[PDB]
């Protein structure tokens, strides 16, 4: 920040205070912008500072007055995302109601849900035709048609900004569609746009880089010939898909660009695709580079400056020892990606339902390492993904266990293989080389009430409630924005009607990825002591709860106790109104508790969050129901 | 929420103005309404629109300058904990005269590195006695000799240019007896006399008195009592009134809008009274704070409170917010259990008591900061409690006692030069006045001559200011301390001071000497000078010591050592200090365990290899490690 820059910005406002106040975001997350970008670019072309602040300097001036507020908002509330209030849901815009207009149609549900962030899966223009579920871009600046336009999502955000919502889309950052323009403009031979990709004239960068790279499709291959570069690009994912050259700078500027253009149309939060595969360095996987991390940030600090009501979230599944530098280590925590996904909770949860052992979940929780306290996970039960068990070998032996013959036990039991299983899961894939397989299905059918719906029994079909309402509340007391996937609320088994349709047949995650029938939630709504009521309404009190428990603040981590049942989980979070300490029995059986871990930090006398009863912890044992929680904190004894 | 909105959006003509206020008012509402329903209960409800007027009155006022530097406090929530802030600590009158005078010196200042500049009461006081400015007769004004409000706010708008925050002491408490409101009072106005605790008869005062460890006076037109807890001209104010308040919000957005960025709260812990109590250290108080904090929040949020209370520290975390209040009650105050520490350490050449209080002190919340010093304007008192001695193995009173022996110049063979100041006719226990280098051994040691022992002295002084410098939070230097000035014995010779001999700490600023220690690197005050400025340069580049970390003890298996450990992103820090003469060793492992294999001390610049069994450590060094 030099005196050029300083008047080049005074000079392009006609109001002082937007000057002064562009100036001092300027001052304060310059560090993190400049530092970061030559530590990539390196001694470059020196013009890029002033290219940069032309972006911004635009972007800013078209910030609309509402999102200016927001943004001042934001700065006073910088921990927004991290409040125990935040709860968020996750639909297919035409899945759930069809078009953007639709969408506002139902924001009543969704307000009275207390849900304060909509993730809304892909819906930026993809080419037409096969398009990997909307990761194929064709531009970032419009809609798929049948969605609705851009101004439909500016609509839809002004909408959710009414209820207090934030919109949150999926940005790939890695690839376009070969019908971007991007793409043509380099395929008609614009050298500006050659250089927007990996372009190769022989067959030898190409080999020298497939030396060490793995395969993401197990199509097969990293790279594609086309006609009019003849020439290789570079194309991880599939064909129709080309990897950006991040180290042109030129790219950088367009997505600074492009973040801030659909800030400016209401998004708040960004989930950041692909963001692994940025950097191409060889003899390495490409992916993970350090040189990922210094772009996150300067693409953060951009927004940090032009709209501080945004936030990022990283999309990437990795073990945890690759996972944390997603949200910062060294000289970032929290000046790169702000969320993340808690990818091992998930598969933890699973694997506890199904093992009703919790040594293998105190193990990887363990071996976690701490996130920068202003950051925060995104914890969900399921998504619109397949289920892979990521259960790493160390944490297994850790338990006593083996890694493969744990993994293919989940993969049998929630299958549908195994003797006396409760799940009715699909096979998505298996891949040879390992044994290892992945499992589609929804929540409902995953936790035993497809089967018990089959036997009409009354107490495995409660077994099924519980089981659904336990792994929400884990979600919803861990801390971080617990991500409700569409229909999880009303218990949706899985939908074999995907099989007639003969796009989805093909591919059947379809299975878990259901239309929402409006109906069906209206009849769920008057019939509460149904299965799908059970659970509805189970679910509204566990949200309301939440949303009142301020020791579920996100700053603040959950510490395993370890647990003198393997039945049970035992999980701490220290908090300055007390501790609370929360109990979950992961198994159908009666489990007697030994009172001395939870006496140890909570004192004598208790009161559960959930149902409100008191518990005495100078008891030798406390009493858990099979698949019960309580969230414990202090309390006294009158009586 | 509703009558504030209408009220509120019309209140300004611009519409930023007003967007920006309703914005804050729904962030900082619930601390402010909760808080004065939880003191004046939900009884008195014109209240709200009552602040409101005051509040958007403060906001109107406020110039577009304080606005801007308001915005930044947003962007670095955080600007009191960076490793860059000193403070500095001065007498307006004893550093430069007046204040348009401390403007000629701001190179010194800026030159420091100080970025907080605490001035002592300058808020206008009767005349007579003033129990040192503590005696307030109007908070708009300030004390004539030292100038206007208009040079108050000129000073702060060349301090702002250097970047430096000026801070002021405002007594909550009580107000000079010649105050407008204790006049208006004694003229029989009503709602003045409500500004005060007033009885008619001895029964009341002596129903207080009966827990209250004179706190009444007589006067003819209020005939009756007032309470009074210091002196008698000082009129404990009412806080049971709202009216008062109001008073007191309109005078801090009133001292803001001037340029005052941190209030030094003074008697804060004496606001509440309560029949039954020693009417110190009541809930009121923090609910109190917490409302004039969130004000503060709302119209300026540049400003900072910081809470004068010397109590024990079970009691003292609390000024800094506990419970629902966590970080409402302040955003600083003193350390002074560590400040008891440095110096009983370089007395005994033990720190087995530093490590015990420092472990018995509770965290903190990470968004306040303490503010540390080795000496002020105050007599040291040995708050040295009784259980932190018993963990230790001594005897409290025994060692309480050792102190005063030893800072007095009494024990046989101390390098102290202080004097007695308060002596108890009951424990024996005593207050010592003197400035760091003469308790640090200097004077004694220029009447000797000795190289051996001067060097000794400047040693010291380093030692204790680099305690301070990386202990976490804002380290107060004390005026002329970097020139290691001793005891000035021509106090008596005043005969406004010679009653009060902690004027025997507090010189007068002489320029031509400070010019003479800049140009003098190897005289002992020039050993001292260029190493404070050193010690000072490598702070401001010490990520490590951003004042939300909290210092750890590490337990030391050499009692001439203090071990300190601080976590830190970028990889951790350990503190090594010596607090004897002679050279200690300490063992590999204990470091090798926290940092790794090859380090670095920030404070010299060489390398350490923790490869050999031991570490030499000679006397008095400071080695501030981190990994590399």
Same mark, same amino acid.
């Given at each position: 920040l030099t005196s050029e820059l300083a008047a080049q910005v005074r000079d392009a406002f006609d109001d002082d205070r937007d000057a002064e106040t562009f100036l001092l975001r300027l001052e304060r997350y310059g560090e993190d912008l400049w530092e970061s970008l030559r530590a990539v670019?390196?001694?470059?072309?020196?013009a890029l500072p002033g290219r940069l602040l032309e972006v911004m300097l635009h972007a800013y001036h078209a910030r609309p007055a509402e999102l200016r507020r927001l943004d001042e908002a934001r700065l006073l509330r910088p921990d927004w995302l991290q409040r125990p209030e935040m709860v968020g849901y996750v639909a297919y815009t035409d899945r759930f109601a069809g078009t953007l207009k639709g969408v506002e149609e139902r924001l009543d549900y969704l307000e009275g849900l207390g849900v304060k962030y909509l993730h809304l899966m892909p819906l930026l223009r993809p080419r037409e035709g096969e398009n990997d579920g909307g990761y194929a &871009?064709?531009?970032? +600046?419009?809609?798929?048609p049948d969605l609705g336009t851009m101004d439909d999502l500016s609509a839809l955000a002004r909408a959710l900004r009414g209820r207090g919502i934030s919109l949150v889309l999926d940005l790939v950052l890695n690839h376009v569609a070969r019908e971007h323009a991007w793409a043509q403009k380099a395929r008609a031979g614009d050298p500006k746009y050659r250089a927007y990709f990996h372009l190769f004239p022989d067959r030898r960068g190409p080999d020298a880089f497939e030396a060490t790279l793995p395969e993401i499709?197990?199509?097969?291959?990293?790279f594609s010939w086309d006609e009019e570069i003849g020439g290789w690009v570079w194309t991880?994912?599939?064909?129709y898909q080309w990897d950006l050259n991040?180290?042109?700078p030129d790219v950088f500027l367009e997505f600074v660009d492009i973040i801030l253009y659909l800030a400016n149309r209401? &998004?708040?939060?960004? +989930?950041?695709?692909?963001?692994?595969?940025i950097w191409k360095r060889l003899?390495?996987?490409?992916?993970?580079?350090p040189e990922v991390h210094h772009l996150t940030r300067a693409l953060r600090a951009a927004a940090r400056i032009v709209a501080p009501a945004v936030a990022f979230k990283a999309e990437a599944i990795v073990a945890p020892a690759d996972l944390i530098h997603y949200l910062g280590t060294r000289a970032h925590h929290g000046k790169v990606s702000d969320m993340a996904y808690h990818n091992s909770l998930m598969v933890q949860l699973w694997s506890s339902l199904a093992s009703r052992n919790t040594r293998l979940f105190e193990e990887a929780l363990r071996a976690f390492p701490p996130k920068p306290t202003s950051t925060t996970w995104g914890l969900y039960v399921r998504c619109h993904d397949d289920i892979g068990w990521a259960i790493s070998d160390e944490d297994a032996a850790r338990a006593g266990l083996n890694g493969a013959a744990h993994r293919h036990f989940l993969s049998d039991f929630y299958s549908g293989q195994?003797?006396?299983?409760?799940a009715r899961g699909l096979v998505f894939q298996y891949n040879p080389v390992n044994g290892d397989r992945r499992i589609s299905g929804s929540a409902a059918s995953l936790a035993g009430l497809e089967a018990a719906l089959e036997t009409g029994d009354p107490g495995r079909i409660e077994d099924a409630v519980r089981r659904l309402l336990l792994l929400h509340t884990v979600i919803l007391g861990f801390g971080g924005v617990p991500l409700l996937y569409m229909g999880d609320e009303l218990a949706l088994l899985n939908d074999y009607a995907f099989e007639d349709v003969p796009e989805h047949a093909?591919?059947?995650?379809?299975?878990?990825?259901p239309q929402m029938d409006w109906a069906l939630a209206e009849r769920v709504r008057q019939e509460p002591s149904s299965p799908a009521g059970r659970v509805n309404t189970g679910l509204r009190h566990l949200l309301r709860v939440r949303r009142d428990t301020?020791?579920?603040?996100?700053?603040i981590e959950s510490q395993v106790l370890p647990?003198?049942?393997?039945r049970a989980l035992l999980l701490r979070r220290d908090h300055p109104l007390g501790g609370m300490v929360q109990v979950y029995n992961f198994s159908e059986e009666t489990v007697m508790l030994p009172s001395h871990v939870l006496r140890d930090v909570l004192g004598d006398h208790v009161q559960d969050r959930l149902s409100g009863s008191a518990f005495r912890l100078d008891r030798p044992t406390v009493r858990l129901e099979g698949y019960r929680a309580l969230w414990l904190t202090a309390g006294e004894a009158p009586a």
């Open positions: 670019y390196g001694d470059q072309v020196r &871009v064709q531009d970032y +600046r419009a809609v798929r499709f197990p199509a097969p291959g990293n991880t994912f599939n064909s991040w180290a042109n209401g &998004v708040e939060v960004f +989930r950041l695709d692909a963001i692994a595969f003899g390495t996987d490409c992916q993970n580079q195994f003797p006396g299983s409760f093909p591919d059947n995650r379809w299975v878990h990825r301020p020791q579920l603040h996100a700053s647990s003198p049942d393997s």
